[PDB]
Design a protein around this nucleic acid. Structure first.
Ligand SMILES: [Mg+2]
Ligand SMILES: [Mg+2]
Ligand SMILES: [Mg+2]
Ligand SMILES: [Mg+2]
Ligand SMILES: [Mg+2]
Ligand SMILES: [Mg+2]
Ligand SMILES: [Mg+2]
Ligand SMILES: [Mg+2]
Ligand SMILES: [Mg+2]
Ligand SMILES: [Mg+2]
Ligand SMILES: [Mg+2]
Ligand SMILES: [Mg+2]
Ligand SMILES: [Mg+2]
Ligand SMILES: [Mg+2]
Ligand SMILES: [Mg+2]
Ligand SMILES: [Mg+2]
Lengths: 209, 124, 72, 61
RNA sequence: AGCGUUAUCCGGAAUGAUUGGGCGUAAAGCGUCUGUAGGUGGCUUUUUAAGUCCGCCGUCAAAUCCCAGGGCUCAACCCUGGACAGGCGGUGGAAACUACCAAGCUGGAGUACGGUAGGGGCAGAGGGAAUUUCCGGUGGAGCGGUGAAAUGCGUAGAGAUCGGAAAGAACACCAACGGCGAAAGCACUCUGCUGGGCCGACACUGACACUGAGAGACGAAAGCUAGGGGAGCGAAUGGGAUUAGAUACCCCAGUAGUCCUAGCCGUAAACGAUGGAUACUAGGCGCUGUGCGUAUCGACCCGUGCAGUGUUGUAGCUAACGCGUUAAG
């Protein structure tokens, strides 16, 4: 990214550089794009469930639309801790959240006072903000994708704790030892995001058969 | 000061930082030491060059184990050994580089040769 | 000029002699006294090297420069 | 430390702290009693414990 | 057919840590530096074979210990045979390493040069304000001090206010995320003599190195011995207050000392609470000194090398705090 921001970790995966800005290497990643799409295409044929972790404001809706093409899951807003590790509490909130959508169908809102209906309204509205793309998970995924390492530092660690392979943000900001699969060059713009995101989401489609 | 005391450390520090190259100094003694690590499978490759009349060597390390090292015979305290007290590091997983009258060899090669010498550094 | 052993002793012999006459007046210049003992020590280790390599040059150098020989 | 310092005999053992100098190493020793009495022990405990002031034959009171 | 107590030695005890510990804060780095003996010591080719390794000979009695065998009805025990390991001496070989001997190199160190920053040190001259005292002019009642008050100074004219003589000591602003020095320390200005460091390179030296027991030198303030000086501030000692008390904190006066030149004393939280030298080990910020190149080639700026100096921080270490290329790796 810059002379004051380059991590010495990526030194094997750097080719050249310029006036201030940094130049990433497109050769080594191309092998990993093949290894990634080969592993994702092979995994999707067995019927696994995947997850994507994207909360950056520039790619908040792109990751949302990215999950509709396949039967995977997305995380549009923050991680709020213990999503996968404290799964017992997550099932309680999802079993809770799943029920409240059936609660709204009944005519019990009439017999509740004004303020009480507002709390139930703001209660369900708060869970929708963080538990949107998980309503049809019913279990733990097998592979989890990370769109941003810096902003979602917590999500990358629960995968390492639970022992789940993952994809990361191997551009010069972060540490490459955290994920086995390595795909740099995604902090440039949506062009670097959609070019990679659509490519990997594409491979899931044919793997699904 | 002791050159070989520095040789064992430049290879040790490279593994702690987990690097491939070493750029180790070249001498009559080190070229024999490095030659043993090639055949024994501790290093992938070695290579020589120069910048001045002096010379150097470039090693190629392997990519939860650790490349343990240890020096034994120091300038302040030299250590020798006879044939019957040749060590056996970890039942054979390690080796000892020792200097005999017929140059330097591995302890196993000394067990067959029948001649002890000056142990300089253990490996495991 | 050259950098031979006997030449370094000649320059120190003048550098030392130049400071003795200075300390006769400025005897309280203790910082220079710390530098005086360096050149007195540097020549001591050079002449110590000249001795065991060749004694002929030692006896000839000390004779012309009027240098005190060390015991032992 | 440096081996040259070891040759100076920097290290020595610690001498014995034997808890019966009066016996002079023997297991028992005879002595005449001089004054029998009692004494109050340390603060937490409380009793009148019996003792005897003895003159041993080894030259110790 | 003994069991317990006591005493003595070893072990446990890595609790004197060769094997096998530690010295930032838990006990532990001399206040610092120079250097004698001593210890260790760069690279390359030869010499010798002292150390070291191998093969033989002699010897380290027997008993005991170890292995085997045998004999007391078994065992203890007795007997036969044979050790290994290790030590000394001799003898014939191997020559890497330590060492020795004869020649070579330059990377470590040093010299000669050419540049360069700085409160390095010593000595001698120059400068202003401020304060104090005295001299007078002006003028007339308070001044000064405190949490409140008083002592005290003052109509014998204080304080204040202009003018003037003199003295002593210390150097605002510049001034810091700063420089130099081995430390202790060095800041108003110059000048003289003088030390050390950094870098450049194409003169040269050829390991002439590191550390350092004893020893020696320097070494904040305080204090001492003579001779001077003494404005201000200030142990002690007085006085006025606060207090049950106040040999204190507060206030008013104030001696030694604080200063200079000779010398003694040689102690500090003399701290980075961290000994010195050397090699290796991710980075980020910016401060000097000196080069290189780009550049506006007027410097600047930008980009890099070297030697330093500070702040975050990865691996790793650490009981933890924290250290972290200036390590506590
Ligand atoms: Mg050597
Ligand atoms: Mg012990
Ligand atoms: Mg030890
Ligand atoms: Mg201890
Ligand atoms: Mg303490
Ligand atoms: Mg302590
Ligand atoms: Mg020294
Ligand atoms: Mg015997
Ligand atoms: Mg030889
Ligand atoms: Mg001493
Ligand atoms: Mg004083
Ligand atoms: Mg002291
Ligand atoms: Mg100090
Ligand atoms: Mg101390
Ligand atoms: Mg110190
Ligand atoms: Mg740090």
């Amino acid at each position: 990214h810059g002379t004051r921001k380059w991590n010495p970790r990526m030194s094997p995966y750097i080719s050249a550089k310029c006036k201030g800005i940094h130049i990433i290497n497109l050769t080594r990643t191309a092998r990993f794009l093949s290894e990634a799409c080969d592993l994702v295409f092979d995994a999707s044929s067995r019927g696994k469930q995947f997850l994507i972790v994207g909360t950056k404001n520039k790619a908040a809706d792109s990751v949302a639309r990215a999950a509709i093409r396949a039967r995977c899951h997305y995380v549009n807003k923050k991680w709020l801790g213990g999503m996968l590790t404290n799964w017992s509490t997550t099932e309680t909130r999802l079993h809770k959240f799943r029920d409240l959508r059936m609660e709204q169908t009944a005519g019990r809102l009439a017999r509740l006072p004004k303020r009480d209906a507002a709390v139930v309204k703001r209660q369900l509205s708060h869970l929708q903000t963080y538990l949107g793309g998980i309503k049809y998970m019913t279990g733990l995924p097998d592979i989890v994708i990370i769109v941003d390492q810096q902003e979602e530092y917590t999500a990358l660690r629960e995968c390492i704790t639970l022992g789940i392979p993952t994809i990361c943000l191997i551009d010069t900001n972060c540490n490459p030892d955290l994920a086995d699969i390595s795909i740099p060059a995604n902090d440039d713009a949506i062009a670097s995001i959609r070019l990679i995101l659509t490519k990997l989401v594409f491979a899931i489609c044919e793997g699904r058969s | 000061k002791d050159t070989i005391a520095d040789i064992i450390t430049c290879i040790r520090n490279a593994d702690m930082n987990r690097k491939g190259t070493v750029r180790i100094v070249s001498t009559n003694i080190t070229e024999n030491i490095v030659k043993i690590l090639l055949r024994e499978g501790f290093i992938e490759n070695a290579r020589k060059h120069q910048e001045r009349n002096k010379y150097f060597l470039v090693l190629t390390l392997r990519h939860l184990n650790t490349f343990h090292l240890k020096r034994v015979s120091r300038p302040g305290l030299r250590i020798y050994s006879n044939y019957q007290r040749i060590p056996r590091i970890l039942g054979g997983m390690g080796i000892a580089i020792l200097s005999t009258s017929r140059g330097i060899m591995t302890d196993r090669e000394a067990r067959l040769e029948g001649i002890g010498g000056e142990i300089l550094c253990y490996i495991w | 000029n050259k950098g031979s052993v006997e030449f370094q002793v000649f320059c120190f012999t003048n550098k030392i002699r130049r400071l003795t006459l200075h300390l006769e007046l400025h005897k309280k210049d203790y910082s220079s006294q710390r530098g005086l003992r360096k050149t007195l020590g540097k020549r001591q280790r050079l002449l110590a090297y000249l001795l065991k390599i060749n004694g002929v040059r030692y006896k000839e150098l000390i004779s012309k420069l009027n240098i005190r020989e060390l015991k032992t | 430390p440096t081996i040259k310092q070891l040759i100076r005999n920097t290290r020595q053992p610690i001498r014995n702290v034997t808890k019966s100098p009066a016996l002079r190493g023997c297991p028992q020793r005879r002595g005449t009693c001089t004054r029998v009495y009692t004494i109050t022990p340390k603060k937490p405990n409380s009793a009148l414990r019996k003792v005897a002031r003895v003159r041993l034959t080894s030259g110790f009171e």
